[PDB]
């Protein structure tokens, strides 16, 4: 699984694999990250709750940690830190469950 970090640790190539290892759920998530690398309407509009805010079967427990979301092993740029960590490795769930602007906009989820 360490290959996931090995790709996402740096941005030298346009290979989608770096972002396919970033997000494990809905294609739209790492699709927008592949074309942008930064926040986007669709990137947090259909998202908000799940492994990486996604609506797919939780398998690696991103709500706490996966073993690939280790802060010591993943380099953090300003844009990387905000988008990557908050979307995937965010453990909290407050009034803003999105990457940025969420005026009481909570995506459907179950407790």
Curated annotation (Swiss-Prot):
Coiled coil: none annotated. Expressed in AVM, ALM, PVM and PLM touch neurons. Residues 1-103 are cytoplasmic. It is found in: Membrane; Cell projection, Axon. Subunit of an amiloride-sensitive cation channel (degenerin channel complex) permeable for sodium, potassium, lithium and N-methylglucamine, and required for mechanosensory transduction (touch sensitivity). Negatively regulates the turning step of male mating behavior. Belongs to the amiloride-sensitive sodium channel (TC 1.A.6) family. Component of a non-voltage-gated amiloride-sensitive cation channel complex (also called the degenerin channel complex) composed of at least the mec-2, mec-4, mec-6 and mec-10 subunits; the complex mediates mechanotransduction in touch cells. Interacts with mec-2, mec-6 and mec-10. Mutations in mec-4 results in the degeneration of a small set of neurons which typically swell to several times their normal diameter before they disappear, presumably due to lysis. This is Degenerin mec-4. It comes from Caenorhabditis elegans. The gene is mec-4. The chain holds residues 1 to 103 of 768 of the full protein.
